[PDB]
Amino acid sequence: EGREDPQLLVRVRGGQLRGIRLKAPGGPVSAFLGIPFAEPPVGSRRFMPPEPKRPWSGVLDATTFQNVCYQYVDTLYPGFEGTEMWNPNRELSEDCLYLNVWTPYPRPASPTPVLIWIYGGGFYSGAASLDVYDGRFLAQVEGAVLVSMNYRVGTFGFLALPGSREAPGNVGLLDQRLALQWVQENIAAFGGDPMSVTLFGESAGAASVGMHILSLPSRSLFHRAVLQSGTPNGPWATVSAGEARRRATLLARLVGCPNDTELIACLRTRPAQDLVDHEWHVLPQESIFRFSFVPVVDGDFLSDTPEALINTGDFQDLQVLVGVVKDEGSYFLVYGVPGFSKDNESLISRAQFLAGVRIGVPQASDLAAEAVVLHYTDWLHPEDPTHLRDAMSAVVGDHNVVCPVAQLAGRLAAQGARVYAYIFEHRASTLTWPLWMGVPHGYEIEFIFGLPLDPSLNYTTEERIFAQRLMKYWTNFARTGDPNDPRDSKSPQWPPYTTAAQQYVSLNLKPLEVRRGLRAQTCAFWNRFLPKLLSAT
């Protein structure tokens, strides 16, 4: 040391760190980027649970984001911002278990409520270093301590031969847990309060949060949780041990590998790209909103299905914020349902709707499919292309997010949790996806993190004010278990979601409007009737 900035030097369990002073619109923040929290899970450690990072010597430079965990990269629309913004923005490597910290500058004087972000990406993709996950705005404007970690995705994170020692499954979730332990031991050195840790995540990140809620060793590592557009329950976030075994075995065959020990040993000799290049090929049916390698119900991390666990758990101690965007499903249609594209209006035919339902509900028998079609058909205009288009999107949206969220909120509420629910209805003026996609999956995130406060990003003034409201809701919830501003009454209030009143709020440019019932009739179909229908055919 000596001639550097004394307000950026910090020590953690593993050694000394040097961070960097970043500019946010309203003033400086402290960033500590690319802190290793585990031994690199490379070589003989592929598919293995992470081990704690061994201490380093000297001052580790923590001024740049580290490698992105090895993953599939999206090529559907080359150079198109709407997809590229989700793509990896650092080198791909199996050596990727690093986390990031943003704090006020100078670091706070008294212990400060901590937010931990867990990114989504269907458990096959994602990075804590993407622009839309920039912690500088929350840190500066709200004083937050924000932590985001990389966790293994795809095969490296979730390939499992359940019961084996060399590929037990869920190691990507264990990566997340280790970072949560890391925060408990170390965040006080940044001025963070380890006794006030709130998780939040979107999509698969949201399901991840749900799984930490349902896994008792994680429960002592956080106090509050936010789930954006994702649930541990539902049709995509988990797979049985049997199906995980089948998928892992198939992928092995596809890449040359013929006793679990031998199979896995062969898999470890494969280049990481050979695994990625065959990842999408092990799905049992033509599907959208399905992902090959995801958490497995192993009887360990998850002692039973999420459905069983949320049905029979005590949650009096728990405060959760859950919600959805207006058009959860539209995004997914163009990655598989014939007739859909980002470059036209995607008006489809009844025939294409019927084919789309089979793809969006890949597990449905012919009867169950017909039930879906009859429910979502408008029988005053059963062949109107526009209606069939938006119905296809609603089928995928409802089945995958909105009704799993509706069930989660309902079960948690019935079992003592304090639940707050929202629907996010504002479409970013900057959005590059077509209008027909409305407010797609993932496009509330940039507002929660407060990107519109960045003048160079060309958001409107109203969007700027909006983002600020949202940042207050999330941070007030992190601080108190309550999104409402205590020092405020004039602004409309956000009631808890109950089973009796089923209240939730609209989040848009207008002030909070309280609504009752979260697709109540339609989710009764998905959550109550469909399972019995499938079970009888």
Place this chain on the structure above:
Amino acid sequence: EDPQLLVRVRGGQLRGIRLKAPGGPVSAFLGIPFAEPPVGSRRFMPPEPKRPWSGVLDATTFQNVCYQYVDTLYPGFEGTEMWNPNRELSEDCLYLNVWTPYPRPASPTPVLIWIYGGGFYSGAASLDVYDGRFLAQVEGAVLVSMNYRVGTFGFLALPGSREAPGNVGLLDQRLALQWVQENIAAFGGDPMSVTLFGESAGAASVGMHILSLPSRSLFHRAVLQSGTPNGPWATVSAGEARRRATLLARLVGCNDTELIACLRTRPAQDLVDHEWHVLPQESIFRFSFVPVVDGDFLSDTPEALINTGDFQDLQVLVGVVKDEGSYFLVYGVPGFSKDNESLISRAQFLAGVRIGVPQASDLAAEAVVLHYTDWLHPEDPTHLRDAMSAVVGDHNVVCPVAQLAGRLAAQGARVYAYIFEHRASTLTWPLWMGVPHGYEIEFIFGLPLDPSLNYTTEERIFAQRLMKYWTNFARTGDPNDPRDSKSPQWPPYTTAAQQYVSLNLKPLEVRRGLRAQTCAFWNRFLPKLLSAT
């Protein structure tokens, strides 16, 4: 003698009677025999034409009511008694009634023929709500109504037997239609313009005449109020008819010939006493002896026939009342009564769905319950009550009607559809029942025009509108007044726009889709489901 009251028909001379309607006199000829009394060995048999008679047959009085069960659930109560027989019971009951204006029309006049309902187990053409004088006086109509055999006497069947072939109550109707062709011209009626109209089982009967070729040369237009030949209650298979007839026989102590012979020795009331005991399930809106798919009067099931028929020649007016189901709940479903608000629990609601949909599997009944529950208030007694009613009305009338309208329109027919939403100010059933099954009829027949019935002025004005639509439909096949040039008008029901009108105190309103989402469930999904279970 008044020459206006003397008519000669092919069977001999009739004398009728002059009756007062609020705006003037009408000629009525009541109690005209159109068949040989279907008594003794002629029980369960096809009717035969009435033999000629000497002198002048007195036709100034309603004849006897076909032998039937009499309702006793609420003894003395106007709301039920108004449907009970108002003349003596007799198997000797095959007679019809004719109202015409006074004096007899000088031009041949459109004929309306009323077929009563009563679940094929009851009914009579002599009920006060079927009084034809108002239509005859105000609209100058010639109106005809016949008694037809009901219950075991009209529909007990041993398919394929000669002595109980089934459907004879429908042949009773057909013979009266033939009679009208042969004789109505003597009353001033136009045999070349005959419109059937009927309600509930009557509507269904009308529907079956549409689907039976020998009936088609006897009428030109049809009105089906709150009833269809398709659906769950209007017909039974040959096998199920055989089963019920055999069970009834067993129950009263009885080779087909020998079975039916013993049945013919049984006093009438002995059959009625066990009539309601041959149903396969604990049911409501389900009747023991109804038309049978004999492969003769009905060459195939009504759904097969309306699915394949050519109805380009046809004009039809069809409709429903607001609360088709309410009436029936108090006749079986625990929790329901006319004497309290019938607020039920969720348990009772599930229990009542099994009774309202007797043929549903566990899964199918769960589907009904899940579809009709308001999940914003899944346990609210008022919603559950009103939903129980809706299940029964939608399953049995509204969706069957919507299917018929749809298939007829798609296959060339000219269709007009309504929903009747005015509740009679004189109604004696409780408010929660709303506008029950049957309570449009008194308005169509023009009863409010009678000062002594204490209807309101607006209800009088409304009855005159309804009589206008119905008679205009009879004259032209189009219920719209060809002189009233003010919008809106009653548009044709089509498969595309699915337009129908509301009938109430306010001017016609045009709506689209007759419970389309809900009827898609009943008409399209449920049958896949019962089948798959």
